[PDB]
Design a protein around this ligand. Sequence first.
Ligand SMILES: [Cl-]
Ligand SMILES: [Cl-]
Ligand SMILES: [Cl-]
Ligand SMILES: [Cl-]
Lengths: 217, 52, 263, 263
Amino acid sequence: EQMIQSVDRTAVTGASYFTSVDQSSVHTAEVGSHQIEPLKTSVDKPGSKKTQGEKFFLIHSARWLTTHALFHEVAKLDVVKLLYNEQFAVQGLLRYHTYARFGIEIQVQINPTPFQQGGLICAMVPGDQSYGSIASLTVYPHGLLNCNINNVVRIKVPFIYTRGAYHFKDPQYPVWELTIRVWSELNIGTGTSAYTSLNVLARFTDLELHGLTPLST
Amino acid sequence: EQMIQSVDRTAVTGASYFTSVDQSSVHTAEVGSHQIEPLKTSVDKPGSKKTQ
Amino acid sequence: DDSGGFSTTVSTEQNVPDPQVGITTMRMDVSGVQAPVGAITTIEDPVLAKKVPETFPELKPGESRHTSDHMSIYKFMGRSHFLCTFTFNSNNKEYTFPITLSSTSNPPHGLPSTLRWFFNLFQLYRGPLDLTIIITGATDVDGMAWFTPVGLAVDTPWVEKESALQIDYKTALGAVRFNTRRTGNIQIRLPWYSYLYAVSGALDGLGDKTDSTFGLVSIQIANYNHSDEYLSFSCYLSVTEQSEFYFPRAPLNSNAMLSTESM
Amino acid sequence: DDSGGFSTTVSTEQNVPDPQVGITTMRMDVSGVQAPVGAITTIEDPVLAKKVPETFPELKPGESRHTSDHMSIYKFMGRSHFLCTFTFNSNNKEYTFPITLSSTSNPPHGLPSTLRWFFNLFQLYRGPLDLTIIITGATDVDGMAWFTPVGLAVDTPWVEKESALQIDYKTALGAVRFNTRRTGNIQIRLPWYSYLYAVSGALDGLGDKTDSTFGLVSIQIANYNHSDEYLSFSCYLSVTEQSEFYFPRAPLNSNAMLSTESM
Ligand SMILES: [Cl-]
Ligand SMILES: [Cl-]
Ligand SMILES: [Cl-]
Ligand SMILES: [Cl-]
């Protein structure tokens, strides 16, 4: 006795985090297959979590003056919060995940003319500076800047928090508060430029995103 | 192709001289099993045709 | 599925290209004295729909009497079909016509008959084409022709006028010269020189203006005292083996199939 | 770098935890009659800065006379330090104090002396704590105490008042009962029961209200006719071996180190 083929009523399909249960189903139709460009139309690595999220972006940028007294805070930044912003690509990933854990890499640079002298200190402080001794900032993952010497510093850290991840849409407390203060008054000779601009670069490392969400705030 | 489990419509149950035919059936639920008194509550032969 | 997708029912190929040959041959019976299971199916299901159709007992057809299979695109379109035709009125003038798949552009200012039909059977085309052009009328008329790729300078389309291009420029893109007396026809190959991956006929306005063109041809006459006869030009195209055709479309409905009615 | 980053110069560990022992021992000279290269360096560079400091010829220190190394946090903080103290005025009342690292909350309504200092030397804390409390004054006073985890119901903090909690509820979270006559002191362990990964002292307002607390302790007296003496309670905390300390911070500046001045 020959059995004659009849469609398969019930079935379950989906992809990533979307599932469908269908009761009066049928099979899926497909045509052709994936083709690989024998001649690539673009040579850059195809977009990936790392491509778009684990790269560098310019966070903030300020000035350092001869008028700035010792320990003057030239910058106080919620590194994380700053990245979360349309201005940078990484947003596209954050904007749609509720929480995420990660490490960070900070690069701070300046351009003092050898006729200038003095220095700054850059520290990655978790949460808040609280009442920590300004003079002991070196304890935190830091980078020291001295005109006569270097014009750049780089710090790299992992996830350090009280919670298992940061909540973007509505945070509890900033993961990192990067502080930049005058470590030695910036003096100069009569005629030299009385300032030097400064920038801050940041990027995530080992970016673990979690829970796709439609929210925005 | 993965086949997905769907209940078994028709079925037949019963005991001794009582039979049932069910058309929109499903499986039977059971919990635990028969327990034997480690300490009998009664020592007489359990009722049986001969007993009674 | 490598795309992180999952399913419980399968996914088979739908409408697969070049399924069977086009000439009666044996690639017994074709179906019979058994039970025609392929007489029933649920067309909505892609898998089931592929089940081979069979209703009654038939025998194997046999062998066709002719060598080649007329349904092989390469061989069929291998017959250079009609493209367009124009006529010169004054001397030292030129005509420039584009080779556009556009279903929109209606002839004479567009693809006609067969060529029109053919190029709308699929979505993407690429590869060289063997153009051949017949000269009608006049004589002792010196002429020249050049292939201009999409996106570059070229005299205004579908229009007879005095060229506005440096002789240098023209010749530079690769050109040919001939004389009506000594010939009366030219068969030269058109290159796949385009910044696109391929071209298409079925498109919408915008793209229909850039991605629907192989390229353009320009013919310029000389020494044609109109005290002479008239000068007519007819162009025909034939597909080459280095030509490719990707993704089958639903054929153009009859009302859109037009032909340049003449003689 | 697995993060798709690249560099041409290196990246070494900066300020590495537990670098050397805290007791004079040999883990010849320590440096000498050679050439003190570690007398010069470019502190701005993380690598170079780790170069071992050496300026003059010295000899090996030798051996300390005492067994244990006083600089091992576990052993040092192993000395149960002072936390807080309060006094009951009426009968059948209760006091509930939170264990908060917050550098903000100033004593008596907050972490004092050593404990205050210690918990601000690093960013994250987690792990059980051995609380021990001394009873002062009264006698034949029945009492009870229970540990309440962050985020749950509990009588208003830093305040003596009549409990507003079901005896059931109290006992349910695990509690203890005692009597001044028979004892005068209690040493019980506080669990790491929190929905957080860890807690911290240095924070800002918001988080400083949820993520800066281990938990809370509540002590309720009974049978204390105030015709009697006064009833004082003093609490001290000692870190356990199952306690962990992650990421070193810059110590609190002196002006912020406060102590509950009494006697
Ligand atoms: Cl002649
Ligand atoms: Cl003109
Ligand atoms: Cl001749
Ligand atoms: Cl009260």
